Structure formats: structure tokens, C-alpha cells
Amino acid sequence: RIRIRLKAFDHRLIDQATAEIVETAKRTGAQVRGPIPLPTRKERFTVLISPHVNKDARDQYEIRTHLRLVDIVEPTEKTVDALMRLDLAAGVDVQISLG
Amino acid sequence: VTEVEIDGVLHEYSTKEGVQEDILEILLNLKGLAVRVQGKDEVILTLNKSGIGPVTAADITHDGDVEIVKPQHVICHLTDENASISMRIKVQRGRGYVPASTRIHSEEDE
Amino acid sequence: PRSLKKGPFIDLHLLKKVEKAVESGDKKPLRTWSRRSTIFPNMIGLTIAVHNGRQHVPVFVTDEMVGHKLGEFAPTRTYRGHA
Amino acid sequence: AKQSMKAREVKRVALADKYFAKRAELKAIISDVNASDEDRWNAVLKLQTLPRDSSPSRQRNRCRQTGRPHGFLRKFGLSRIKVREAAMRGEIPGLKKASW
Amino acid sequence: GQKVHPNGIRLGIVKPWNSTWFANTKEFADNLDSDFKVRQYLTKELAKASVSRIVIERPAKSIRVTIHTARPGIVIGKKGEDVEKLRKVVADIAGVPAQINIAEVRKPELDAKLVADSITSQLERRVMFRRAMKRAVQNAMRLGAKGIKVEVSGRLGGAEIARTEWYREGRVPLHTLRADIDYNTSEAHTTYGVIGVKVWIFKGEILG
Amino acid sequence: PRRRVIGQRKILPDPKFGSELLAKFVNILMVDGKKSTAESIVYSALETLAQRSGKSELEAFEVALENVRPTVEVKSRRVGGSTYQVPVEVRPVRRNALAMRWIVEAARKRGDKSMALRLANELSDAAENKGTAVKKREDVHRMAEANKAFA
Amino acid sequence: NQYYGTGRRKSSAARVFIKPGNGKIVINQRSLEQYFGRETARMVVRQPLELVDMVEKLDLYITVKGGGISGQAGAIRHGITRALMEYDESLRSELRKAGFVTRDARQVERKKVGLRKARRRPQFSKR
RNA sequence: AGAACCUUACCUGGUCUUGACAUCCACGGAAGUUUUCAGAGAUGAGAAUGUGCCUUCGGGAACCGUGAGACAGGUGCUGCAUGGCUGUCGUCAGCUCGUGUUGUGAAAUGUUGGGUUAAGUCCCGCAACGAGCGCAACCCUUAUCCUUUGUUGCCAGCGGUCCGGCCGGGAACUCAAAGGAGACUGCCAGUGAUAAACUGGAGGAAGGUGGGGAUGACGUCAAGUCAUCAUGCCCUUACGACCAGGGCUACACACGUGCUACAAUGGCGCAUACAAAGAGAAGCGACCUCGCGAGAGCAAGCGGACCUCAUAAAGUGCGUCGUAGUCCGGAUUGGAGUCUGCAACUCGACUCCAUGAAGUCGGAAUCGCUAGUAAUCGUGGAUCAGAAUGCCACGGUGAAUACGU
């Protein structure tokens, strides 16, 4: 089975990507597993915002890396190849893995 | 076909290195194209080819949800083996007839 | 202290100098900056003027000084008293 | 930071890049309990001979824009001050002010 | 240092990011550095061309730049001569295949950054700062800004004691997150010193 | 506070006897949010006390409490140049609390070994009308009496 | 046939199932006395049942995750209450009166920059 | 958001001077690759390979070498020349403007007054009428529900069992995200000026801003920062650059902020239960073997809801100690060692064995906190080779009190 790991910072974008991938899968092949949402990584950062000194002065940023696990149960001839030409939107790191 | 983007081009009335049809001929032969998308409503294809011989429509590096149903539609006739052509087509979806003059200011997305 | 498996530490150059001295049988003081160098059995008898940051202070090596380092016998700070 | 400091850092990095294979090998030799004493000694001495700037524990992480040694972040390669600026500008992707 | 950055507070809601890519902790710093480089280069090059926003977007080991500029003609030059030139240098800077797009900025009086730049330029060529500020404000208003504020600070008219002066017109709500507040800044490197120019331009509120 | 009076928060009755007062006492006793240990101690105190005086566990405790509750406490107005301590009638909710607190203090003070044992002893004393808490109560009363002129 | 209610309190998440029976409580394949060593916890889990005389009438299978002991107990209680509500739907008023239907929304307040804790400010001095 | 070296800006010596870092020509050499002796090292002297993209051949672009200067360089001075960024009063409810009107005018009015509010919040009046910046709302998070999607997450009901959700499976539940619903004084009664509101109650997961965060008006302090950065006199064979060693860790003393204690609500021993949130490829490193232990060896699983860090601790049960400077307390010092690292002397952390200071709740005075708060218990992260009792995060247990001004 083809496991697909979508990773992105924007959630909407990721969602869009996932849908597209599903569409790509579903026309060619059959029995797409589904878009399973894994836990989001909220990598936080604190920094001092003064140039020199004021330690209680701080900004707390974060990067929300979202995960989408799409799986394809039956890899056909037509389906797997379809993704080669079918590149997804920018800012979405995909990671296909058969078996 | 709505917008055609050829590399190393200034306007549509120029000419290019290594081809037969001129650029107005290429735009007419691209206006005759027959595409069938499934999921999206606006896609971008890619055509890249070098070498002596005609450029069919079957040489476009397709994505998954686009289907080019005329694999003998000719576009160019590449004559020089050192010549290349890399155009990026944009395929919308609508109805009726919307021409270039009205679509000269209608287009909002700068 | 240093690990037993690693052995004792002595600066290579310093060691060489010591060897040379031994060969000679001379007793002129060897000015040295290697304060981190451990003292060796063969170094016994030699005067070796160890740097203290500022100046080289003469250290006549003894049987008791072997396990120790050269910087132990060359104090850097110079405090007499507050009054 | 100064230009000079930056240059020094660069040099150090270069040295590290150069001498990695040898240094690592030497380290391995030194570690290896199933080995000769003399060999080990040689290795130890050999290491000393190699340049100091060849060590990776010599090089300090500085900001890639300003060269500021302190307040550094690894993910961005930038000092806090610059990082913040980047965030404000939209230049770091995904990064926005966090509240919870 | 009272105020929060108006762009920065709104990135999740009404404002988008400039650099728009994903990368793991491994390649992220490098990417950032590259972005910084390319942007810097672009600024250096297209100073005379009125450039507002460089948007970098890298998918699949290939960098896509998008230059928002008021006059494409000077950035493009002859059709695909200057752009092409820019591209290879961009690629070099990055170390990947480059692709430059050029967005045409409609209404450069309403783009805040551009306005700021203009003001700075004016300052440099020894105009009355106040008159420049007025012009900036007025023009924006005319163009259909719901509001605009501009602020200039330090060594105004080469005076020994530095001060800040600012002109607002219309409404410029900063606490309101859903307000499209185009904020940007610039610096006039005059004979007496630097003169920092801030400008806030309120396009309107977004409803979603 | 200035602006608004607020409703006292909900307190659960203890699992052994099903009493609010007991629970409150336990809470008072507690330190570092170690409730369980404190409650155990309280239980121990009760049991020993029960053994000593007969009656029930709860009833005895109540009786003990009764002998250390203050009718009247004092507060410092100080309107003049020197300070005047003024008596005030101390309300039902507060009086109960105060007695408990005093008892706890006494227990803490006491020279016996285990905490629970000490507590038990204190309770016994209260019941009999000798000890530390009782003394404190008397003192409080005495002060009030002294300053009865102010009202 | 088995009825159900979800329990939640602090970071705990109980899964209470109500069935008709004799009144044996199992929490993660362990008895009430085994799982909760604390009496208070036991009391809290039995509270709702005590309030509406169905202690002997119904068995309940529970599995709980997250939080500590007291929190877990609370969650369990909540779950039980929910189950009861589902099952009868005429005991709601009593439950409301008790204060068991209410999800106790008290979470731990986050630590805040500047402060050592949620509210503890560091030691101040003019000099 | 981490001084052994480095960092480093300081000291001591040893050295360099178009230079460590750039651009420019001139012309000597392809770059680079390997190795040798002296030296603390910086540097100062040797042996091997190569000639790629192009020439009506006066040669070129990358990358070393030498000399000239143009210049580089400066964590040098001025934060009282500046920008930017920051603190602060203060998340205090304020601060203004246009037009009108009043006053010779500075100014006033609006913005005051009656009520009310967390709020210049809202209503009513009124020479004001309007507007803006702020007080509110929009944003994140947390509390309830529903829909969607179910692996690496889950196990209600089914069968099988090595009694492990592990394996058939199931999509219920938890959980995971994505999208919706929900709270508005909307509904009820009373008080109120026919009001804005207030007081209570109904429902509800939540009630009157539900809890928390982000958000900081005009301005103030010639507040802080020229040593992040940028920027408007001074040094330029040295106030620049390279190096090794030392110092920033000094110690009659005074203050600030913390940790650990002084014990029995405890210490010690044995058993045993319940978290959250994070990090991880020059990385996290199971299992197994060895070591009293720090660790060592071997070495899977894993860019990770999968594997690893990783046993939560307080707690609970049973035993012991019995108020002692103690089976409290752990400083200090001796020995021996482990790991990181060219390198632990100055000056790392941790381990083992020994040693066992002061300290029995702290003078004048003084700080924090109104709830999942304080108090207490552990856990993680950043910087980081190594080096936290600090900082930033996470959950566990979990109070007291608020009469009032």
C-alpha cells in the first residue's frame, strides 16, 4: 500500500493538497484509504525583543507543522504513475512510500 | 487554452530559433487544442522538447488529472537539433466566447 | 584528574627538552610555559623555570614533585595582604 | 560582530571540513580498547599535532546576517533580534506570534 | 517600544507570508539565508524600479521569485532581456533553478512601502519633509485609502535636537486584527543622519 | 475587596463521616497541598479522641471546637492619635474557622511526637477546658472585655 | 443494550459504560478498591450513584486515561453522570442540583514569561 | 538561550602591515591535492600532480603569489547628533481633531451634568454637531456538542488466543485535526427616569468580558542600547590583523535574586499506582552483556501519534528510626574514577568510598499570591562537545481568606 505523508505550515493549503491527491488517486485506482490527520507539531520559540537589555520583554513565536496521512490500498499501473506529472502546490512537502 | 508562456519571447509577432511555424501560427495551433481536466478548474501544463522533428500534442508532460485527447495534434516543427522550446500553457474552464480585448482589463489577478 | 587509560600529560616539546638536558648532564634552567605538563621521574634534579603569566620562576624538581604538574609550583596571583 | 571575527569563524569551519576524516579516525583509534598502547599514544600525539581550528568544538554559532555570538537560534541560523525582524516581515515561513 | 508590528500580528488572518515554503529543521536555516541573499540582491538592483514586495516560493528544488513592482517596464526592460539576466543571478545566489515572475502593482500611492520609499527619496534630495508627508497622505486619500498614517523621525531639517512628526488622515485601526493595514518602513540617509519613515495604509476590513 | 462581594466556593464533605466542618478542618491542617496525609492525621486524632472521651468521633470533635470558639474578637480602628482596639461580634462562618485554626496552631506548637497524637491531645484539652487554644480564646475575649467601652 | 457517558476533568478522560446488574465497578480491569487507593476518590466516583439510588441496580465498566488520581476520579464521576442522563433522562434535575452535570473547566493556568509560575511574581525590591 | 580552548571584546609576550575580511589593475603561477624540519603556535624553509571553458595567438574567467597605491579594518568616542528596537507610568481609560459657538486673548465648549459600566461602556439631558486614536469586538487557546476522516491512535460488541489490542476485525468510545453549532442579559421576574442598566433564576458544558493569552492610545523619563544591526570625530607599521598562555572564575567585606536545609504533615528501606508537554540524524539510542555506580561494549527501531530520550515524583501499603545537632542536614575536604573535549592545573559535569560545617524556623524590617491561584511534587525544551539551583514551557496534588474601605 502507498502511504503518503503531507507536511505543511499552512493548514488550509495542506487540506487543499490532500483533496487534490485524493482526486488523483480515485479516478485512476480504487479504494483510496482516506485523509487521516496526525498530530500537529507546534514548535515554539521564545526570544528577547530588546536590542540590549530587558529580559521580561519577550515574543513567543511558533511554527505549526501539520501532518496529513493519505494511504492508497491498491496500487494499479495507471494510478501510481499519475502523481509523477501531478505536482502539488508549493509549501507542501509530500512523502509517498509504497509498502 | 487561455495564456501561453514561451521563454525568451518579447511579443507574439516575433519569431523563434529552430522552429517552422511562427508564433502566431503556434498560438493558433494551441487555440485548437482539446483538453479534458477532471478535478481542478485551472491547471498549468508544460511542453519541453528538443531535437529535429515535429512537436505533437503527445509531448506535453501531463499531470494526473489532465487528459490530452488528441495525440496527433501538431504544434511546432523543430528543425535545428540545438533548438529548444519550453512553453507553459494555462487552461481555464468556462463557456461561450471570451476574447482577448475584453479579457485585457477583466482579468483581476494582477 | 586525567583518566588512567589516557596516561600522564606532558607537552611534547617540553619532554624533548628534558631528554636533551638529561643527555647533556647540564643544570642550566629551562624556561618553560607548559604549566599543564606533569612532572616525570627523569625531570628530578633539573631546574625548570615555569611561567606564572608574568615571569619564569625557577623550580628545582624533587622526588616528591613527580605526580604533580609544573603550574602547581609557580603561583600566578600575587596577594600580600589587605593592610 | 566584526568582519575579522566572521572571517576567523569561516576559517575554522573550513578547517573542520578539511580535517574531519582524519580527526575522527584518530579519535576512534584512541577510543578502541582492543588496540596497542604505543599506537594509542601515537594517535594521541598525532591529534595534538593537527591544527586547533580543525576541532568542531572550537567554532561558535553566530548569526548568519550580523555575526552576533549570543542569542542564537539553530533552526533559523539567526540571532534573536534578526529572527524577530524576519518574523515581523513575513520572511520566516509559518512563524507567527503564539498565544495559549 | 510600545507598538506591535502591524504586518506581524496579522500573518495568520488577513496578511500572508512573503517566503512561502516548507522545510525540515535541516534545510530551513540555509533556505532563510538564501532568501535573505536573493532579496538583498533584488533590492540593490531594482532600487530605481519601484519595488514593493519580493515573494519567494520554492517547490521541488527550484526557486520561484515573484517581484511586486509599480513599473514592470524598467524591471523587464526589453521583453525578456532584463528578467532573464536577473534569473541566472538569482539561481546562482540560491544554487538551484530560478524562476522570476513580475506582478504589476496597481495604485503605487496606496502601497505603503512604495510611498515610504518615495518619501525617503524626497528627503534625500532636500525637500521640506512636512510637504512630502502631506503629499503622501493626500495622494493616498485621493486614490481611495480608507485611511493612511505616515511618521517621520530624527534630524528633521538638519536640526540638532531630533524629533518625530506624523500625519494621519481617515481611520487607521491597528488593534483591529481584521483590518487590512499595509505597514512598511524606510530610512533616508541624509547629510545630517538617518531619517526613518513609517507609513500605515488602511485598505479596509476583511469579512470572513 | 472594593468592587464586589463573591459567593464562597463549594467544599466537599469528608469520605469517612460525611461532614463539611471536618473537611474544612482537614484542609486547614493540610500543608503543601498534601491533603491525603493531613486527612489521615485528622482521622487518627479523631479515633484516639473518641477512645478517650467516648461519645462519637464527630460529636467529641464538635464539643472540643465549642470550647475554643470566640463570641467576640477585636480589630484596630486607630481613628485617634493612638490606636484603639475595638470589639466586634464575630460571625458564625468565621468563628468556627478561627477556633479550628487556633487548634491547629496549638497542635503545631505541642511537644508530643506524632502530629496526629498532638492534635488529639489538643482536642482533649479543649473538651476539658485547658490547653493552648482555650487560653488563646480567653485572651481574645479578655481583650474585648477590656476594650468594651468602644462600640 | 449498555448505556454510555464520556468523562472529562483536568487532563483525564474516563469512558464509563452503564449496564443493568448487581453493582460491581471495574476501572481498567481492576476493582474500585484496587485502582483508587484513596477514599475521597472512591466517594467521588460513588457520589452520583448515591444521589440517585441505583448503586445495587447497575454494573459499570470504566476505562480512564490521563491526569492524576483526583482528576481521574472526577472525570469518572462526570462520565457516570452522563451515562445516567442518557439512560433515564428524568434524573437530570437532581444531578444539576448536586453539581455533577457541570464539566469542571478548571485547567492548570499556563506559566507566563516574567513570572516564576501562572501568577507567582518574582521577589520585588525597591533597592 | 550557557566564559576551559574557542567565545573575547581584556592582560602578557611572540608576530603581520594594502593587510584576517572586499573591489581594482599590473604581471609571476592553473586552482587544489598530498607530505618534511624548526617553532608555544602564528609562521618560515622542502618533495609530488595538473595546464579546463578560447585565440587575424599585445591573452583571458575561476584560485594562489608579489609590489604600488586608491582603500580595507576598528566590540574606538558621542544613545546629550540619530534610525531601529526596548523598558516605563499602564492594558491605566484616557488623548485629540474638524466645523460651529463663547471669550480682547491664553483658552473654553465638545470631553461637563443625572444615572450606569471593567471601560470617554451605554443611555438621558445639554452650544454643540460630528470624527479619529484608544475601550469593546475581530485573532490564538481553553470548557460542551455535532459532522467528516480513522493510522502509527482507539477497543464498545463480535470470534480466536502465547491473556499483550496482539490478530481477524470493528468503526462505536477516547484521541487526533479540519469544518460547523453554542452565550447574546437572548428568555423570566423585580428595581429603575416610559431608560441605560442593576439584582436575582430558568435553562445550559459554560452567565453576564465564561478562564487564560496576544493586543500597550496621545505622550512621559535628552529612560536603555553607537558592543546585534544601521547611522551623522578619532586611529591607520596601529585604537587594525594572527598566535600561544593567562584573565573575565581573583576575595577583609556589603547588597540583590535563587536552591537546600533546620526535620516525624519527616528521614531511610522494600513493594506499588496515576501525567502532560516536548526533543531527536556530526542526533535520540531499546534490548542483551559487563561495571557497586557515573558509564562501557555490542547494536536494533526511528527525520518519528510507530522507535528512542523515558522509570514521572509527590502519593499508596508494609517495616523501621522516637525529638537527639539525630538514621535531621548536607557544606567542606581526602582518595579513586567516568564522560565530553587537541586539552578539564588555573576552571567542567557526573559517579563511588570516606569526611559530616553552619543550621533547632531567622533583628529591624520586607516580598508574592483571590483558584486549579498560592503552596508543594516531579517532567521537558532552548543555548549546548561538555557545562543550570537560571530562563522558557508541561502536567500532578492542591489550600486559606476577602467583614469591609
Side-chain angles (χ1 to χ4, degrees), chain C residues 8 10 15 18-19 22 38-46 48 61-68:
Chain C
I10 177 157
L15 180 62
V18 164
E19 286 275 36
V22 166
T38 314
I39 295 160
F40 276 66
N42 57 60
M43 298 166 63
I44 298 161
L46 298 171
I48 40 188
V61 180
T62 318
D63 195 277
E64 299 279 22
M65 295 191 183
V66 173
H68 288 40

Side-chain angles (χ1 to χ4, degrees), chain F residues 112-130:
Chain F
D112 293 295
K113 294 186 167 153
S114 185
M115 175 53 198
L117 281 176
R118 283 160 151 178
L119 205 170
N121 283 21
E122 220 305 303
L123 282 168
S124 189
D125 276 35
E128 201 270 351
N129 208 103
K130 69 185 193 296

Side-chain angles (χ1 to χ4, degrees), chain G residues 1-6 15-26 45-46 48-49 52 54-63 76-88 91:
Chain G
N1 186 40
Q2 80 302 307
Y3 294 78
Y4 170 82
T6 308
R15 291 174 60 258
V16 181
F17 297 88
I18 284 283
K19 293 173 197 65
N22 322 331
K24 309 85 54 50
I25 298 80
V26 175
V45 301
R46 285 160 175 168
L49 290 189
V52 289
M54 289 191 169
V55 193
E56 271 281 346
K57 186 59 73 282
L58 38 77
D59 304 338
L60 45 97
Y61 179 72
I62 303 162
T63 65
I76 283 163
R77 187 183 94 192
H78 195 244
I80 284 163
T81 59
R82 277 211 145 143
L84 255 51
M85 281 201 291
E86 195 82 337
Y87 163 92
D88 206 317
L91 311 168

Side-chain angles (χ1 to χ4, degrees), chain G residues 33-127:
Chain G
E33 303 296 299
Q34 295 180 45
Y35 195 79
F36 288 128
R38 190 149 162 71
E39 295 294 339
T40 307
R42 286 169 197 176
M43 190 202 69
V44 300
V45 301
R46 285 160 175 168
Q47 263 194 139
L49 290 189
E50 280 214 312
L51 193 82
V52 289
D53 289 36
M54 289 191 169
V55 193
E56 271 281 346
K57 186 59 73 282
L58 38 77
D59 304 338
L60 45 97
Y61 179 72
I62 303 162
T63 65
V64 69
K65 295 181 198 155
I69 299 296
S70 58
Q72 261 191 355
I76 283 163
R77 187 183 94 192
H78 195 244
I80 284 163
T81 59
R82 277 211 145 143
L84 255 51
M85 281 201 291
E86 195 82 337
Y87 163 92
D88 206 317
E89 197 54 48
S90 188
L91 311 168
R92 260 219 174 184
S93 182
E94 289 189 58
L95 269 40
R96 268 277 164 194
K97 194 165 291 310
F100 308 148
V101 300
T102 305
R103 201 285 201 191
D104 201 46
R106 298 188 280 182
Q107 308 303 80
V108 303
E109 192 178 310
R110 64 161 283 196
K111 195 207 154 289
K112 296 162 199 184
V113 42
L115 292 16
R116 280 146 50 77
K117 291 211 283 157
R119 300 195 180 181
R120 169 162 207 78
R121 203 166 294 283
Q123 185 167 292
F124 167 86
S125 190
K126 292 180 174 189
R127 307 163 201 81

Side-chain angles (χ1 to χ4, degrees), chain A residues 14-86:
Chain A
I14 224 179
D15 283 20
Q16 192 182 352
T18 310
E20 210 259 81
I21 191 270
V22 165
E23 253 62 89
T24 309
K26 199 176 196 74
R27 294 183 291 93
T28 51
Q31 292 192 138
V32 175
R33 212 299 91 73
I36 300 156
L38 305 172
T40 308
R41 190 197 173 178
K42 301 186 179 187
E43 186 181 1
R44 295 193 163 87
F45 312 92
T46 307
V47 293
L48 297 194
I49 66 176
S50 183
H52 191 246
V53 75
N54 291 137
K55 187 122 182 205
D56 299 339
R58 268 158 161 151
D59 262 36
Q60 290 180 305
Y61 306 112
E62 76 187 328
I63 300 169
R64 292 200 190 179
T65 303
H66 309 275
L67 267 289
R68 290 297 191 286
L69 187 280
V70 191
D71 175 27
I72 316 296
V73 183
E74 280 76 24
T76 67
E77 187 185 323
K78 294 169 284 299
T79 305
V80 173
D81 78 60
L83 268 24
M84 162 166 105
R85 273 125 197 195
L86 225 282

